[PDB]
Amino acid sequence: AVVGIDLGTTNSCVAVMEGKQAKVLENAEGARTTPSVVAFTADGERLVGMPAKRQAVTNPNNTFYATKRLIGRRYDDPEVQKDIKNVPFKIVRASNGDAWVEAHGKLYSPSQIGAFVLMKMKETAENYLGHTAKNAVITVPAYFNDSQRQATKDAGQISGLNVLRVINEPTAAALAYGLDKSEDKVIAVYDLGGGTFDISILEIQKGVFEVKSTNGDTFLGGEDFDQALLRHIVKEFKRETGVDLTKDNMALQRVREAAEKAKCELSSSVQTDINLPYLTMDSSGPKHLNMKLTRAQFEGIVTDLIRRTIAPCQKAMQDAEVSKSDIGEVILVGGMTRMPKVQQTVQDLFGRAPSKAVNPDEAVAIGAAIQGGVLA
Ligand SMILES: Nc1ncnc2c1ncn2[C@@H]1O[C@H](COP(=O)(O)OP(=O)(O)O)[C@@H](O)[C@H]1O
Ligand SMILES: [Mg+2]
């Protein structure tokens, strides 16, 4: 039996076909998605998933995240250079010119780090199916070259998986939205995720998809929404407590966690409270953080990032030679497309109501599970 795995830059997701209905699998922590973050403790253990995410700010050296921008890429790649400036961990040049990483002295490869994620994903799949997980359908971005796709297949095979097929993420979401059975239509895939923004235009002819154009920003994702709110929260805390949280890593780690949760609640509620009891220790006394945040306050803080996804979408329509009246349906991928203002931009960008049929942070994995059941 074969599982579908979305190996995302920020969060990964595993799914397996259960008859004619797809099934997203919950990991050991009960989450339906696993953070694509690997860390090595000072004790020496290796942390994968949420146990590693809750430590990124406190232990920034021995924590690897967003390594998907490094996989299948040489050290002299522009994308590796830009990503090298935006990380606290060591990004080293491999012997063969590729880009590797180092933690506690020992070196690791992007395929090796990606395998650590896939180990827990297969461990999640095993805990369901029972026995062992041998076959797997893994997804990649449409813009991945040949060297990147082989490095992704490396990561699956290092974890012990047999990568049957390697489909594209925008094609995977199309299978999750059931457009596999349509006749003919031109589709736009709006993928705003944790670390990358991807806009893809797909054409379906008699049941076969075709990638017309590809654009977006690979450094524009949900992580930037988190940091903007974090920077705002820390500022309104120096104006109320006179303390800059940047000096307490544990405090900051708490803040990032609380900031993202605030953004997630604001997608279905217009107001939420951030209560961090006993955050920092001052000379005067233990300080606290109680903050009321509205959806309108947040939309204005991150309106710059939402607008920055608009130009790559229009450039994709001229490279695809399509217009607003040619695109038959728009589907949303990535958990960030749950933000109602991001949904409003998509509606004001293609003239149609965006399809909110599949969980955007689960659509890629569901589509890979569609491919798995067919290869069985
Ligand atoms: N309900 C939600 N509302 C707003 N933002 C969300 C919600 N769920 C997840 N997010 C954000 O979207 C991102 C999820 O990305 P994900 O679906 O894992 O795509 P990928 O990891 O493949 O890039 C995370 O950064 C998270 O902060
Ligand atoms: Mg994604």
- Residue to substitute in 68, 196, 260, 336 for testing ligand 1 pocket (most ligand atoms within 8 angstroms of CB): 336
Amino acid identity, position 32: R
Q: Tell me whether residue 235 is one of the annotated catalytic residues.
A: no
Identify the bridge partners of residue 360 per DSSP, sorted by sequence position: none
Q: Tell me whether residue 6 is one of the annotated catalytic residues.
A: yes
Q: How far apart are CA 99 and CA 36, in angstroms?
A: 18
Atom of ligand 1 nearest to the CA of 8: 22
DSSP letter, residue 55: T
Give me ligand 2 centre to Cα 127, in Å.
24
Contact 140, 59 (CB under 8 A): no
Q: From residue 24, how far is each of 3, 34, 132, 360, 367 by CA, in Å?
A: 10, 12, 17, 12, 11
DSSP annotation string for 201-242: EEEEETTEEEEEEEEEETT-SHHHHHHHHHHHHHHHHHTTSS
Q: Which two tokens stand for residue 338?
A: 């749950």
Give me ligand 2 centre to Cα 74, in Å.
23
Query: If residue 15 lies in a helix (H) or strand (E), which one and from where to where?
Result: strand 11-18
Q: Tell me whether residue 68 is one of the annotated catalytic residues.
A: yes
Task: Considering the candidates 98, 154, 169, 329, report the single residue annotated as catalytic.
Answer: 169
Q: Tell me whether residue 106 is one of the annotated catalytic residues.
A: no
Identify the bridge partners of residue 46 per DSSP, sorted by sequence position: 40
Q: From residue 158, how far is each of 14, 66, 99 by CA, in Å?
A: 17, 19, 18
Confirm whether residue 246 is marked as ligand binding: no
Confirm whether residue 338 is marked as ligand binding: yes
Q: Dihedral of CA 304/309/312/318: which sign?
A: negative
Q: How far apart are CA 108 and CA 101, in angstroms?
A: 5
Question: Within its chain, how far is the Cα of 355 from the centroid?
Answer: 20
Q: How far apart are CA 319 and CA 259, in angstroms?
A: 37
Give me ligand 1 centre to Cα 338, in Å.
8
Confirm whether residue 11 is marked as ligand binding: yes
Going by C-alpha positions, the residue among 18, 12, 7, 4 that lies closest to residue 32 is 12
Contact 11, 365 (CB under 8 A): no
Q: How far apart are CA 290 and CA 310, in angstroms?
A: 35
Confirm whether residue 67 is marked as ligand binding: no
In the chain the domains, ranked by start, together with CATH numbers, are: 1-64+117-182+356-373 (3.30.420.40), 65-116 (3.30.30.30), 183-220+309-355 (3.30.420.40), 221-308 (3.90.640.10)
Going by C-alpha positions, the residue among 187, 181, 184 that lies closest to residue 199 is 187
- Contacts by 150-154, CB closer than 8 A, 24 or more apart: 150/72, 151/71, 151/72, 151/110, 151/111, 151/114, 152/7, 152/71, 152/72, 152/111, 152/114, 154/111, 154/115
Contact 199, 312 (CB under 8 A): yes
Contact 185, 204 (CB under 8 A): yes
Q: How far apart are CA 46 and CA 124, in angstroms?
A: 17
Q: Dihedral of CA 124/128/132/135: which sign?
A: negative
What length does the chain have? Answer: 376
Pocket of ligand 1, beta carbon within 6 A: 8-11, 33, 193-195, 222-223, 260, 263-264, 267, 334-336, 338-339, 361
Give me ligand 2 centre to Cα 4, in Å.
14
Going by C-alpha positions, the residue among 154, 72, 150, 156 that lies closest to residue 119 is 156
Residue with CA nearest ligand 1 atom 8 = 335
Ligand 2 ion local residues (Cβ < 5 A)? 8, 193
